[PDB]
């Protein structure tokens, strides 16, 4: 067991420790988008359930939570823009996500061009 045989093993550990460790930040961004997309997909369901009861759409979040929807997820900024009798607009996004996600009845849940680092969209596209 030489020093050179130990020294080359130390050299390879430095190489393997760099390359084999994956990009963590990028992997979480897409998982964070799934949380935003899932919560908006759930939000659309409980909007339709409130439409059965009251014949309208909710401006406030507490109305949707009372019917059955969960509380806002960790590091997520859910915010309903507006809700008329026969329409709605719900913007939501994760802090370390990719982009903001809108949610309307005609277009469904989709993603906008605005970044999560930038400010919240005033109205959905």
CB 99, CB 93: distance < 8 Å: yes
21 is a contact residue toward a second copy (CB under 8 A): yes
User: Does 105 participate in binding a second copy (rule CB under 8 A)?
Assistant: yes
**Using rule CB under 8 A, residue 15 touches a second copy:** yes
Using CB under 8 A as the binding rule, whether residue 26 contacts a second copy is answered as: yes
Task: Rule CB under 8 A: say whether 115 interacts with a second copy.
Answer: no
Q: Pick from 112, 94, 95: which is nearest to 103 by CA?
A: 112
Q: How far is the CB of 119 from a second copy (least distance, A)?
A: 17
Query: Does residue number 62 form part of the binding site for a second copy (CB under 8 A)?
Result: no
Query: Which residues are within 8 A (CB) of 73 and not within 5 positions of it... i.e. 6 or more apart?
Result: 35, 39
Give the nearest distance from C-beta 18 to a second copy in angstroms. Answer: 7
Contact 51, 43 (CB under 8 A): no
Q: Does 123 bind a second copy (CB under 8 A)?
A: no
Q: How far is CA 31 from CA 25, 26, 66, in A?
A: 10, 9, 27
Interface of this chain with a second copy, residues 72 to 101, rule: CB under 8 A: 73-75, 84-87, 94-96, 98
């Amino acid at each position: 067991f030489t020093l050179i045989e130990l020294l080359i093993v130390i050299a390879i550990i430095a190489i393997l420790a760099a390359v084999l460790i994956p990009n963590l930040l990028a992997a979480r961004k897409r998982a964070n988008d799934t949380v935003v997309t899932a919560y908006l997909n759930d939000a659309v369901k409980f909007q339709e359930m409130y439409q059965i009861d009251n014949n309208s759409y909710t401006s406030n979040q507490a109305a949707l939570i009372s019917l059955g929807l969960k509380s806002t997820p960790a590091n997520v900024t859910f915010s309903i823009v507006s809700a008329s009798a026969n329409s709605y607009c719900m913007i939501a996004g994760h802090s370390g996500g990719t982009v903001w996600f809108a949610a309307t009845p005609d277009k469904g849940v989709y993603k906008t061009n605005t970044a999560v680092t930038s400010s919240q969209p005033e109205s959905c596209p």
